[PDB]
Design a protein around this ligand. Sequence first.
Ligand SMILES: CN(C)c1cccc(C(=O)NN)c1
Length: 330
Amino acid sequence: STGSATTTPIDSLDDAYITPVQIGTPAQTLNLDFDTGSSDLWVFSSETTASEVDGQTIYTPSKSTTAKLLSGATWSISYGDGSSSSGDVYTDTVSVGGLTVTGQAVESAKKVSSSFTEDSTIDGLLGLAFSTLNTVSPTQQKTFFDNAKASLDSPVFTADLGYHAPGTYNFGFIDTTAYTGSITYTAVSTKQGFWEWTSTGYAVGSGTFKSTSIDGIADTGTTLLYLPATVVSAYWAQVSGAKSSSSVGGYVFPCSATLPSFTFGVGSARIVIPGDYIDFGPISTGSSSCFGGIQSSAGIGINIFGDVALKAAFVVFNGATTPTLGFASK
Ligand SMILES: CN(C)c1cccc(C(=O)NN)c1
C-alpha cells in the first residue's frame, strides 16, 4: 500500500503545516501537525476541557463505530516549546492520503496548554519519530508509520514541505518526479528516539563551505533551524544590523535587509536554503525588526533541522531495519 496527502502551511510565515487525517467510522477529518520530532498521535476531542477548545475540530469517539477505549491507558507530553497536552486513549481506524491503519492509538486530549488552544488551525499532532518516545502508559503505543510499515510497498515516508505553499507527505513510495538530481542518504541514530543525523558542514551565502560535523534531528514539528552558536553568529554577521536580542528571544534583523542563503551538507551533497526562507517577519505587528529563521541551539541541548531547513529539500525518512535519512534538492 501507499498514501499521499497534501500538507498546507497554517499561516503566511509557514509556522507549521497541517495535513488532513481521517479518524473513525464514519470518518472524522481533523487537520493534524505531522511531527517527525515526536511519537504521539493526539487530538482535540469531545473530552477536551471546554474552555481549552477555541475553533479546533474535535474527534468524538462516541460517534465512531470502530472506536474502542484502551482501558487504563493515559498519556502526557510536553514539547520543546514548553507546550503540553494529556488525556486518555482510544484505538480506531486512521487514514492518511488513502493509507489506512486499523487499531491505531488515538490519544484523546483532556487538557491542552494555552498555545494549543490559541491556535485554531491545528486539531492535534501525528508523531513520526520512533515509537520508543511514545508517552502512553502503562503500555506504550506505536506510531501511525510503525503500524503501517509492514503493509507499505517500501518502509519509508517522505516530507516535501513548501515555502509559502502546499507540499506533500507520501507513505510507502518515493516520488521520483518530486526532486532534482539524486537523493543522498546519511546515517541515523535512533538512540534518543529521533531522526538524528550528522550534517557535514555549512556555508553562508556565496561563502566557502566549512567542513564540520553537526549532529541534529530532522524535525518537521519545529519551525526554525537551530544550530550551534558559532554557526549562527557566522550567518547573522553577514546581515547589516542583525543582533541577538535577549528581550525578543533570538536573532533579529532589519526588515529592510536582503538575507543571504544558508547551505548545509549531507555527505558530499549540499542543500541550499534561500535567504527568503530565513525571514520570519516583524517581531510584532508593524515593527521594522524582523525575526530570524536561523537561531542558536545553545539553550536546547540539541541541534534541530526544522521546517526552515527541511522545506528546502525532498526528505526521505527510511524506516528500514537500519533507518537512514535521504535529502535531495528540488
Ligand atoms: C526536549 N524536547 C522535549 C524536545 C526536543 C527536540 C524536539 C522536540 C519536539 O517535540 N519536536 N517536534 C522536543
